[PDB]
Symmetry: D3
Subunit: 86 residues, 6 copies
């Protein structure tokens, strides 16, 4: 327990079939994820964000985020370093 | 690709890969079907700022209507919303 | 079927069709089972504005506790939350 | 000096130095006079999430009632609001 | 009383020395104002807005608004039809 | 001109025409002095999402710190914040 660090007004949350939790850390302009049982979060490599607000994850582990200040939606496949703008 | 969004807020994705977004600054809910580049507006009515969205295994879409203090839902292929 | 909501924000639906809403202006999380007609207030404690909600296949509820800079989880049969 | 705030949103200050805050997660508006050490909850009624606040030179308080799609006002010596 | 019309999740509010009330009608992508005693609002001619969130008015009646989805602040002088981007 | 803002939220203006903005997506409060094209960051500390801002006749700046459930203030030319 108490394993996310440095959160600031988290907004969106999603959970996948492995129990990994995805959060839009809305005050910090980033999307973080925490595997089940894990002590250390991962910060997803979305680029160019202006306040991520909502997040969803599909059955293939693709992460979709609303980029509130950029009027767009972005997506990252599981383990990818290269987002796609929807 | 989504076009003309304004301060999108909520996002959901169904078992087929369709993406649903609450276009929170534009008073509407939009989707983008997997297999398609054409966004569609869902026929919700009477909205005052849709804020969050969810989709169930049957394709039913559930939206928080922030300014009406209610949750609205549309079944897959229905144009008739139900209020929860 | 939901009652007394105030600027609901987040919404999630599980595989049973239970709908979960963050009743953001009232500092609480509510759920309504598919086919039920009374809501249940989930026994989260110490919230400062639940904002978003998700639910896993086992019915564990995850909520962003916006003003406490934290994510809380509650198993469906539990009255004791865990902080993530 | 403010107590029990939950995701405060709006803030205003008048010519007397009284500070007014929309205590947005608790569905209420609070004020603290310059040099005082207890807050007063303003007697607005029927709010669904006060979001923004302003105050005129006569001390009349204006609040956006986000979930009721309305603006409410309360004179400093009054217990009865007006809807704009 | 009950003189604003068509509001949708109003957010920001401001009041000037004439008692005119200014509101960001955040769900409708517009800024409205209502003079004291008046039965009919005015809609200010800001352009290109992506969700106005906050509003202020100065002692000269110049209106300043945060354009949340455009990552900017805009201003309109009293009676003007031509905003300035700050 | 303001530069590098992210989802600005609150705005205030003082008797001199200085404009104060809560740069809500960037965890900071900025101002732009009348007579100047150079924005400055106010030395608030410990912020978790500043949401609203007000300024009094003495130039004191008051900010709602949304994620810390508090209001912070800075006197004109002070770098030492006080918590209300
Ligand atoms: Cl928010
Ligand atoms: Cl936001
Ligand atoms: Cl928002
Ligand atoms: Cl909203
Ligand atoms: Cl909100
Ligand atoms: Cl919020
Ligand atoms: Cl908010
Ligand atoms: Cl709100
Ligand atoms: Cl909002
Ligand atoms: Cl907003
Ligand atoms: Cl916001
Ligand atoms: Cl916020």
């Amino acid at each position: 327990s108490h394993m996310f660090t440095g959160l600031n007004t988290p907004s969106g949350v999603a959970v996948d079939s492995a129990g990994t939790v995805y959060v839009t850390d809305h005050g910090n302009n980033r999307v973080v994820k925490l595997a089940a049982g894990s002590n250390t979060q991962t910060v997803l490599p979305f680029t160019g964000l202006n306040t991520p607000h909502g997040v969803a994850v599909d059955s293939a582990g693709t992460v979709y985020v609303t980029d509130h200040g950029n009027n767009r939606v972005v997506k990252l496949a599981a383990g990818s370093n290269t987002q796609t703008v929807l």
